Symmetry: D2
């Protein structure tokens, strides 16, 4: 049994002081001065906030990509997540066009079993479409995976054409599945990459120009048009700039059931980081690229007003050594930045503590909204009787800086090296069991379970 | 003591089954199978929803307007509200340009004391600005009223000019007050009214053309520009059409702290109702006017995505006899439609039950958001330990129709006569005390209190 | 020699009364009371307007399409054009994906030689892209054809994919060629067509729903993105609705060198014509489909302000008998409406005479702009010394109605049967030679020549 | 008699080589190898362009403003205009609120008689509205002035309120007059000015912040709303930024008869010039203020596509000594920059020679469009038989720089000091009489006449 007392509870739509008692894995009751049976583990949350466990709807743990593999394992990844306050993560299951989808799903699925410290689930990538695949997708959905993922980029590896996208969306609508999508243009990026390389422009500073804002805007609008035409519900992952936001907003305004996600690096980093040259710049190469800083205000304002629904990380860790695989051509630099451990602290600091982000909008954008969209709610995403006891006792008096020297991500650099944070998790629990106590990791291996969802977007 | 058991609790960010125990006026604890001391009043909510008491941020009880007076009293008005599921209402305190603001405030304030069945508070109208008035506004704010109200229409009676609007906004920013605003154009409406009358166009069907969508759009954009320039936080009341929504959305997108409210009649009624001729058409005359029905989809879609923040009624009851005061000229028809009693059932029915409105967005738009914006939260607007026990046991199995024959509004007609509803309040409580039991009004006169707020928008 | 005297000359940027003297094929001099050598043919234009010969930048004479062939020949087509005041037309050379481009060009080219009454030129369609084709396109451009044409629809027959579109645009930029484009989405239209048919919806009234406005908007925006990314100059053919106009305007506003064309049927006809059922409805089936009439005001306003650059017809004549080829499924109805003969009179009547279209904007939209965009200017498109003596003595006192009974188009129905017109050509000349005198056709077979252009958009 | 031979004639819709013969004040005939009677003055235009005399629709010669007077006289002003290629200018007749409108008109009118080297006309400012004024405006219009001018700024001196603006527009519609307007917000500018001064911010660098882009956008949109509501035709003077352009474009798109003008300094100068401090910065203080340079591309692109209709100067010359009148407070710096003499060369150089501005669009934006809008066409604005012989033989081989040392404007500084130009007028004529020959001024005092217009916008 667990009892968290004297803490100020804050959810997306409530704020109060009371005690939380969890007999087992779920919250049993809430009230003031609760009496917990003897033996109950008591946590004193005096002077601290008690938030629902945070949820990252977009991470990469196991990933064979751009000639190599992402650095975290479900073990190191889930641990880093917990240290950061994230108690549930949704990983992108990404088998390529040449892989068997069902086999890919089972591979990712088995790599996670007994290896995760916190709960998780997947987004099933659809990198090709045919009779064989349709049958396997029906099976994967039936196993509890209620979300797909398509890419409008990465030609021949992940990208699907209009015909495949259309079929994926019709199937999704039939199964009540929500489709997440990476929006760019596979053809344009490929052509622009070749053009720049043939011109001798090989440095990391040509990554952004090879896939400008106009391309993300085109893909975002195309995706919205297919959703509107098929009747399927969609979700745009890591939207990074105004032109794309305008396209997604226009779709929302005319009634298209589409949702928007932005990832932490696009709120705090900008294109100049990728113009520093050398391995230093390679550390900030991702897709969509970091943009002109003028976009940060746009994203922050949109987040405050709820135009942007969720905030994820698109966590994709690589070692500087791996980044150097593209010292000859920027097209060979493995795309990705690590952030699964810093999302919450960064969002809280620069959004709530030093920004205009309302604290309730913060909880909604970093936990509740994602739980709702992907069928994890009310099990996850909030604090209420019946919900899983995934809690985060947050300390707002803490002051420090982020550094690779103190991170738990299995790679050699931190994207936010030196950034200050005005808070951090003091205690983190997973289904009633303490995983982090006073900055000390005390999690239990294999405690995390796979969360199965029910389709709801017909 | 009160105990509501076996009900499905639904708030903006939670959904579960548990019992709610309120020892006194606030919720003491929540859990499953709670044991209430003997003597506790037990309500069985089996098979029913338990929502937070709903809040109407825009009503008119006492109102000397257009040569006459609104029909409801705080007694009949609060009763009608409760029957409909609304446990808190914010009334527009409206002294005209020729009245002393402080006296006006005190008049409204005393008419409500001991006469309301549920809690309430006010929006202080600023229909002129000068040294004398500034001093009185500071006093009214200090008395707990944290919101102003200005009109960009009704020349010489309620309307303020750019100079006055600017000063009102600067003062609001200084005091941390949020400014609500009726957005049209006092001059244009006056001119267009005169033009139409001089042309012999006197029927009710000329009301809409006298203040077209372009006018509301102009006023909405003007208001946004003054907010952006003064640094004040604003709130647009009863936004009725796309052009205006576009203007308010553009302001939101560029960072202006502005919020949007729409009232129920603009979601379900349209301009043709005011083109029926005679007293029948006069029943549907209000400002802003009912619009072309193409606007209803726009508003519904915007509500579903959270673009529109709150839903109110702009409740302004008049008898058909009073409406006839303008049988000679439409300009003399007292503007207003009654709706304080039907808002919740209408929104639930056409939004949740038969529409695309998510049930959590429904609670937020009809209760929580308004509580947050006007400083009533967390006291009101949600279900959580510490909050006032304002609850609504809602019956989703109920089926019926709205009719003046069964309303409690103190006038002779219902704007939604004949409309079907797929639910209704079964039990309604105010701070732990039952006011409505099984469709029977059992409220206590004078139980309602004035809610004082703290300024928060500096 | 030719002398047109006492006429009021009206061009896009001039208006005056004077005489025009053409010694041979071009205008020799302009002035008042000019003395023409003896033998000169004198035309008295007293009380009439003298416009530059009008130009239709989008017609179909020879066209193997949808299992059949368009009805006009270069002989009947050029004659009908002249009777209507059009002295130059640009035909779409359309070999399909299975045809050899160079052979296709030569086929169209030889069908026109010695068979046209007026001058003409072509837009070279690129329905596929490969090494073989690139070489042939370079040859065709070198032969004087400075414009391409790509289709974003008609899968497997005319439509090109993103890869092919990109390559076509890069080549166009290299050669200084302007690319015209039909903007929809080949995949979406195909899928939506199949869906409707499988649902038993086979009538002509399902044509519009099979390719809604959202699709044209998507293709228009996609095209604009590829122009912006490749640096090529583009031109959107027959833009029919607001969503598409918005997309093209956004591109214009941000600096993309893109131009807009709209065709006469979209200004005067609407979707209901295709909902009349039977062969009557089949007469109004075209692509993009006739739209909701709310779009006509949008197009007219855009034309008046110069947002829409040119007005063409997309003349594609078919007999009702041929239209019946799709009595079983709307997908088999040959798309197209005839209009080459009525464009000028219709535009003049409903635009200038009865609309808000300025007479100079009329000349620019129906003649000069197209001549400029496609390199026919200053040879064609205006009245000035040195220009070809292609003139139209227009009679503004004429009043009549359009009817198939008096048309010269080689088919059995007129799309504007019964429409009134407030003017008509009295005299029409081609390079100094009279082709139409007092409504009598006196043209000379084979007089028309192929106009070769110089590339100018690098 | 005048004969200009061997020149390449370029108008907005024609380009050719021929001779122009003017027997008297108007062009008599055009053709190749024309024979002029003996005594005819012959100008050889070999290797040069022959443009229509350029027209500046917005200048200030006589102006009592901000405690002082503008430096040019109709003598020095018209001379400077001619040297620059401008043969017709429209001056803003600006009596303030305290002046009698009719007297003001007559004052301006008499100051110009016999004192202008080239033709001219006026825009009648309406700085207040009442019965007395309406009567005088009817008289002024009857005297040939077909355009009004209202200011939405300069409180109590020039600015009119909504009531006055509405009445001015209704009268304009009745008389068929077009209304030009300076769009900002009198109240907001006044308040923001006071706020900044009270904060000790007195330097020239606070001018822009005192009237930000949001204000011009608000005024532009307000003006458009009143035009749309009254049915009057409008024209926005010196539009300087994207937000305002967006507002004016939206109005154009929905059918409002509104036109846009931008002045040369907003295309080439930016806000930093006014941040140089001291008298140097004061030289660049005008209204609307110079903006962030990001706006220059927007304006250039809009001009190339015809979104911006005309290009003027808003010529308002002051001596540095006069500028110093506001060394204590920026609000006292007389607003204005000189440019009447450099407009054409600057537009030609940076638009045509070094930009993307098409040469025909150049002639239209600098001459023809303005002539059309203000009823000067076809008398002025083009080259054609019957038109006034106002011609400009332009030399495209000339290369030089602009300097106060060689200007003819009656003040001590040039706003474009040091700017390079790729052309200049070689010969300039006014109604058949040479005013400038090979850079030498040979004009005749009092030759210029007042141009009376006919109302056309009912
Ligand atoms: Zn991605
Ligand atoms: Zn990813
Ligand atoms: Zn109101
Ligand atoms: Zn109201
Ligand atoms: Zn086509
Ligand atoms: Zn076509
Ligand atoms: Zn001005
Ligand atoms: Zn001016």
């Amino acid at each position: 049994p667990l009892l968290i007392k004297n803490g100020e509870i804050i959810t997306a739509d409530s704020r109060y002081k009371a005690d939380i008692y969890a007999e087992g894995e779920t919250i049993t009751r809430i009230g003031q001065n609760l009496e917990a049976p003897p033996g109950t583990e008591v946590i004193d949350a005096t002077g601290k906030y008690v938030f629902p466990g945070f949820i990252d709807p977009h991470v990469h743990i196991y990933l064979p990509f751009m000639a190599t593999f992402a650095k975290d394992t479900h073990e190191t990844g889930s641990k880093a997540a917990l240290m950061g306050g994230t108690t549930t993560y949704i990983e992108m299951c990404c088998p390529s066009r040449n892989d068997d989808a069902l086999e890919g799903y089972q591979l990712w699925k088995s790599k996670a079993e007994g290896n995760s410290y916190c709960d998780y689930t997947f987004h099933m990538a659809v990198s090709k479409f045919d009779e064989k695949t349709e049958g396997q997708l029906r099976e994967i959905v039936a196993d509890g995976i209620s979300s797909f993922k398509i890419f409008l980029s990465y030609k021949n590896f992940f990208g699907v054409d209009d015909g495949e996208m259309y079929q994926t969306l019709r199937l999704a609508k039939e199964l009540g599945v929500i489709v997440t999508a990476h929006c760019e243009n596979a053809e344009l990026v490929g052509r622009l990459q070749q053009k720049l390389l043939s011109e001798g422009k090989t440095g990391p500073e040509w990554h952004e120009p090879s896939r400008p804002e106009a391309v993300e805007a085109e893909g975002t609008a195309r995706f919205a048009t297919f959703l509107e035409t098929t009747g399927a519900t969609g979700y745009v992952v890591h939207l990074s700039c105004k032109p794309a936001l305008d396209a997604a907003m226009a779709a929302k305004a005319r009634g298209v059931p589409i949702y928007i996600e932005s990832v932490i690096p696009h709120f705090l980093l900008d294109k100049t980081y990728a113009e520093r040259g050398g391995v230093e710049a390679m550390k900030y190469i991702m897709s969509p690229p970091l943009r002109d800083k003028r976009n940060q205000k746009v994203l922050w304002d949109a987040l405050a007003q709820g135009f942007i629904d969720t905030v994820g990380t698109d966590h994709c860790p690589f070692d500087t050594e791996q980044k150097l695989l593209g010292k000859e051509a920027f097209t060979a630099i493995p795309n990705g930045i690590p952030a699964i451990e810093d999302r919450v602290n960064l969002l809280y600091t620069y959004g709530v503590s030093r920004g205009r982000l309302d604290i309730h909008r913060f909880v909604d954008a970093a936990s509740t909204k994602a739980a709702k969209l992907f069928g994890l709610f009310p099990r996850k995403g909030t604090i209420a009787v019946g919900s899983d006891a995934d809690l985060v006792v947050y300390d707002p008096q803490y002051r420090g800086t982020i550094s690779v020297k103190t991170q738990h991500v299995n790679n050699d650099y931190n994207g936010f090296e030196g950034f200050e944070i005005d808070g951090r998790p003091s205690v983190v629990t997973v289904r009633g069991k303490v995983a982090v106590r006073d900055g000390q990791f005390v999690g239990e291996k294999g405690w995390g379970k796979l969360l199965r969802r029910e389709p709801m977007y017909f």
